[PDB]
Design a protein around this ligand. Structure first.
Ligand SMILES: *[C@@H]1O[C@H](CO)[C@@H](O[C@@H]2O[C@H](CO)[C@@H](O[C@@H]3O[C@H](CO)[C@@H](O)[C@H](O[C@H]4O[C@H](CO)[C@@H](O)[C@H](O)[C@@H]4O[C@H]4O[C@H](CO)[C@@H](O)[C@H](O)[C@@H]4O)[C@@H]3O)[C@H](O)[C@H]2NC(C)=O)[C@H](O)[C@H]1NC(C)=O
Ligand SMILES: *[C@@H]1O[C@H](CO)[C@@H](O[C@@H]2O[C@H](CO)[C@@H](O[C@@H]3O[C@H](CO)[C@@H](O)[C@H](O[C@H]4O[C@H](CO)[C@@H](O)[C@H](O)[C@@H]4O)[C@@H]3O)[C@H](O)[C@H]2NC(C)=O)[C@H](O)[C@H]1NC(C)=O
Ligand SMILES: *[C@@H]1O[C@H](CO[C@@H]2O[C@@H](C)[C@@H](O)[C@@H](O)[C@@H]2O)[C@@H](O)[C@H](O)[C@H]1NC(C)=O
Ligand SMILES: CN(C)c1ccc2nc3ccc(N(C)C)cc3[s+]c2c1
Ligand SMILES: CN(C)c1ccc2nc3ccc(N(C)C)cc3[s+]c2c1
Lengths: 532, 532
């Protein structure tokens, strides 16, 4: 039977799922590790013990324990990202969509969800892999990994809570795929890992980390890169936050063992309830428990690894959306609300700058303010709003990615860069938020092919074009068809720095993506903060 | 006789001069002080001893001793600014042009020449006051003052060389005009002082200095303001430069008396020959012997005087040219030459930035570089050239003036601001230099009315318009005619910051003259240099 596959861990039975008037196979909720519960909370994951009999892989697994956004109850724009399954610490599972009839040895794509390392689920409607698997004839995997304190509490020096264990979850799923995807018709020497935001940062982290490099062929990073200011902390800052978490829960803090034992006695929701209290600064686009620069998963600082070419050398395809910042200004920055145009005063602009660059002295804040203010028209509430939007996007996503891109391309085997700037016609978020963080994903996963979801024909065409770029890149290391009528997505090079836009209009090639702003963020501002 | 005038210092006899097919009177080379020679070198000026008989005022006086530009021998563009009379330390004279028939009590305008406080002459062709006096029916005075070490060598604490004596020369000429211009038909309660560059800075200095305020009614500043980075030094820096001058001439340096006595034994050309050796930095737009912040002429720092409203409160009319910097890049900055388009490489751009902001650390230099570089096209030699041109103009002229303007207008009785951006059709300098420092002067003095000089009809009209604005402002405190068909030159206000352009095209009102750049120069950069 086509729904029965014998793996090295045991037999799994999948389910036939309908998709655009046809069908494919799905193997949902396959375990790749032992449940990380009890004394295993905060520990590195263990490989799943093989089972006899047949694992029922007909339904989605639990989602990992996480903070649940209730800022807009009932609102699809926000709840679309929340867990849609029961939350559990028993959450280390992966999902596989397989074309029918079963391929012999085809391109594999492994999805890594985002959510700021504090949230995320493999099971979101918007991550349904059936449309991509069916349309591009690829084996689509989605993995899971622990988030929040559960995945990233870091007490460096301790083996009970070393940090980075959520990244190790990801690596174990990748190990599992590497070892077993052949039985589902996947080619394990042609695996592309891809992810958005924290998932994109995660992808770049597996490129960097020696222990992950051998488990995949190439990579796609969407609106995220490993050097993002929010995506990692030092061992000292990780340690401080873990101790602050313990302090919030009345833990004994005399030793790592005392602290960890206390944190393991707590119910998951007790940890989640105080998780946001441990940030060092009043800030936006900052998350409590994230990867840690430990000297193990990351042998040295990310920047020294990038400058010295200490990373997997392969092909990468990556890019950003036009208005990455807007989500994070809505959730915390004064003057921004969901149901107004959010025209920002000078004062709220200043407050927004302070929140956007929490690690900066007054001179730094002035520098940012100068750089993003039109002084011919400084009381224009639209310009202040959009300027803040750009600050948050440039600092947290675009400029870190452009730094990564430029560093990677010196040593890599091929870079393809995109700027996604189409606002979906059926967006429920207000116009001022623009092309929002995470809203290219639905095009990547092919949702505009479903008529019931109210996309335009032009949007269907954009989704097909993106899916085919992604899958063709996964298969060959080049998103362009060997012989096509379409104009080419050009290679990104050190010299010419070319990229394309992704939208419903005819494709255009541009150069030097937001270079003026990114020289400020990547070269001037750091040098300024280091000097004062 | 119309050419004979009795003053409080004695009788003067002038000469009839032709002007645009008519005639007016001229009283040239009238002494307003004792010759500052011998033991009087470096001293404050003494009032001229009254004379019996008739002073022959038929010819121009000597020019003050100064460095003579020989960078382009034979070239009118440069030599037009050099001394056209014999140079002498005996040079404290003023010139008066008087309408015919002699007025009873009319508007007086007193011209103060520029030249970086190291050069300048009252007698230049381009300062011939006859066209302005004749056309606008004003009594036009031009004064002189000591320049270089002779006018500004400063050993604070000493009464033999206190500094600022060139400014005191100017003040004495203004005292003389105040006391005697009535006999030439001038109204001494309606005297406007005006000047360009160091002359404009000088005008603003007489506005600030308590001892000069009462000697004039209103002021016009052209491409200069008292707070310009090149226009003053501290007492300590003045002292250091004077000692360095002595060191260059093998002087005894054990005391102020020893140093000063040595400097007085030297011929004027010996001082001039080493004058440029005492600058502290490799720089452009910096001059050796300039006014000094002494606590006497200037009671406190210029900035504290400006913030507290410690200055003459009256009407001011002032402005700048489009390409103030180009002259100073030609004379020293690598990559710039007179007979090429002077396309600048990145490396020469960097060198130019270093020379333009000599007082800046590397972070400061980076900040300037970032601010004036198009990072989409950073190897464009035209953009690098023009960017450097703007750096030099913004830093040295426009932004200091805009700071002065904004500070003055809070307390003043009326501000009128202009941006002069017409390139003369008969300019001998190359196109890349644009609208050059000092090339509005010829329009102010009415030279385009002379057919032989090869100006266009449109340029004649621009000159008449400028002369009439200047003279009407001098007369009334407002450049606009009570009832005119022309559209108004609007008042400059704190709120709206309006100004006009001056060119052959129809006049347009603009706002916030180069505000983006001047926020950088006036607020950000100083704060940056103070912090590191
Ligand atoms: C594609 O586009 C189509 C067409 O635009 C969309 O189709 C429609 O979708 C909306 C849903 O947003 C639907 O609106 C409902 O209509 C009902 C019938 O008139 C209303 O009764 C209902 O109101 C309830 O929900 C609102 C919140 O959404 C509340 O504000 C309101 O108070 C009502 O709440 C009631 O709910 C509880 C629980 O039942 C009840 O006990 C209480 O009494 C309470 O009052 C909605 O307004 C449209 O009618 C649909 N239109 C058409 C033509 O089909 C479709 O959604 C789009 N598809 C996608 C995928 O986006
Ligand atoms: C990604 O990596 C692949 C594989 O590493 C890489 O493909 C390789 O490109 C190089 C070009 O630099 C090829 O090297 C050439 O091979 C031929 C035939 O074997 C030689 O004759 C060539 O030597 C001549 O030309 C040189 C200039 O390139 C001269 O310096 C020399 O004097 C000779 O005249 C040259 O060595 C190599 O064959 C391919 N390999 C494969 C398997 O295709 C690809 O370019 C990389 N892509 C990116 C975007 O980085
Ligand atoms: C496999 O599982 C299917 C659905 O799984 C279910 O989930 C658990 C938690 C219970 O709620 C259970 O009642 C559900 O059935 C079944 O529909 C299917 O029959 C199962 N097949 C086999 C062979 O076990
Ligand atoms: C969905 N997005 C983008 C975001 C962005 C920032 C955020 N910051 C918070 C800070 C505190 C907090 N508490 C419950 C204390 C909850 C949240 S939720 C949240 C959601
Ligand atoms: C006419 N203009 C704008 C300028 C500008 C700057 C200048 N710098 C100099 C420096 C040294 C020097 N020496 C003779 C040593 C002569 C000059 S001349 C000179 C003329």
């Amino acid at each position: 039977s086509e729904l029965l596959v014998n793996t090295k861990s045991g037999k799994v039975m999948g389910t036939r799922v309908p998709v655009l008037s046809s069908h494919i196979s799905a193997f949902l909720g396959i375990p790749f590790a032992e449940p990380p519960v009890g004394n295993m909370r905060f520990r590195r994951p263990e490989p799943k013990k093989p089972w006899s009999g047949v694992w029922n892989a007909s339904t989605y697994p639990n989602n990992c324990q996480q903070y649940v956004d209730e800022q807009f109850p009932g609102f699809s724009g926000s709840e679309m990202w929340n867990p849609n399954r029961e939350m559990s610490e028993d959450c280390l599972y992966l999902n596989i969509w397989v074309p029918s009839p079963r391929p012999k040895s085809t391109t594999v794509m492994v999805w890594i969800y985002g959510g700021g390392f504090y949230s995320g689920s493999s099971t979101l409607d918007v991550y349904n892999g059936k449309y991509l698997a069916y349309t591009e004839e690829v084996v689509l995997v989605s993995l899971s990994y622990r988030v929040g304190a559960f995945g990233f509490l870091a007490l460096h020096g301790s083996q009970e809570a070393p940090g980075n264990v959520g990244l190790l979850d990801q690596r174990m799923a990748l190990q599992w795929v590497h070892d077993n995807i052949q039985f589902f018709g996947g080619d394990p020497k042609t695996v592309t890992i891809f992810g958005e935001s924290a998932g994109g940062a995660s992808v770049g982290m597996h490129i960097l980390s020696p222990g992950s490099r051998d488990l995949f062929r190439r990579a796609i990073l969407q609106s995220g890169s490993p050097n993002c200011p929010w995506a990692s902390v030092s061992v000292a800052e990780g340690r401080r936050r873990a101790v602050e978490l313990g302090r919030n829960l009345n833990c004994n803090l005399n030793s790592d063992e005392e602290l960890i034992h206390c944190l393991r006695e707590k119910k998951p929701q007790e940890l989640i309830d105080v998780e946001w209290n441990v940030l060092p600064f009043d800030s936006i686009f900052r998350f409590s428990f994230v990867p840690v620069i430990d000297g193990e998963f990351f042998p040295t600082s990310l920047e020294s690894m990038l400058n010295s070419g200490n990373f997997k050398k392969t092909q990468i395809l990556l890019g950003v959306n036009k208005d990455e910042g807007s989500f994070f200004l809505l959730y915390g920055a004064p003057g921004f609300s969901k149901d107004s145009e959010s025209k920002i005063s000078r004062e709220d602009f200043m407050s927004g700058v302070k929140l956007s660059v929490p690690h900066a002295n007054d001179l730094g804040l002035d520098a940012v303010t100068l750089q993003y203010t039109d002084w011919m028209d400084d009381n224009n509430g639209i310009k202040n709003r959009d300027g803040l939007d750009d600050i948050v996007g440039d600092h947290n996503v675009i400029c870190p990615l452009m730094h990564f891109v430029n560093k990677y391309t010196k040593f890599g085997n091929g870079t393809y860069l995109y700027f996604f700037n189409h606002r979906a016609s059926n967006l429920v978020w207000p116009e001022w938020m623009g092309v929002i963080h995470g809203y290219e994903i639905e095009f990547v996963f092919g949702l505009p092919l479903v008529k019931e979801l109210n996309y335009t024909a032009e949007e269907e065409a954009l989704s097909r074009r993106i899916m085919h770029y992604w899958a063709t890149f996964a298969k060959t290391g080049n998103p362009n068809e060997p012989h096509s009528q379409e104009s080419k997505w050009p290679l990104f090079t050190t010299k010419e720095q070319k990229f394309i836009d992704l939208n419903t209009e005819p494709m255009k090639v541009h150069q030097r993506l937001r270079v003026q702003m990114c020289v400020f963020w990547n070269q001037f501002l750091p040098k300024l903060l280091n000097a004062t």
